[PDB]
Structure 1
């Protein structure tokens, strides 16, 4: 419930309790939360993709 998105063709969402590795070519923050059990499961989460629980991560980071 911290962020949401869609990969391949399935919607997915996870709270901060499963997010940690998140980089960003130049789209948003390719984050990894899970993939059915807990294998990170990358995904692209844009500040507009999460419920206001992401754009704030860049507010204190790249600001």
Structure 2
């Protein structure tokens, strides 16, 4: 599955397999993900949006 979100004026669509860490900030689901060049990207979506795969990671990670 993929997560769609806008970050710094750019549209992003990241495969959920790449999501590194995920945490909750109120209604915001915030996360980091693996990118090319050994780098780590950041992203956030509304919980309303939030694919269940991503939300499950929260409950199953929270670390």
Q: What TM-score range do you get, normalising by the shorter chain? A: 0.5 to 0.7
Give the TM-score taking structure 2 as reference length.
0.60
Deviations 1:6-53 (A, max 9, x none): 111001011122012011211321111245645221111223435565
Cα distance change, pair 57–2 in 1 and its aligned pair in 2 (3 A): same
Q: Mind listing any 5+ residue stretches in structure 1 that lack a counterpart?
A: none
Per residue, is there more helix in 1 or in 2? 2
Matched length: 63
**Is 45-54 or 17-26 further displaced after alignment?**
45-54
Per residue, is there more strand in 1 or in 2? 2
Q: Give the aligned CA root-mean-square deviation in angstroms.
A: 3.4
- The aligned counterpart of 2:29 is 29
Give the TM-score taking structure 1 as reference length.
0.60
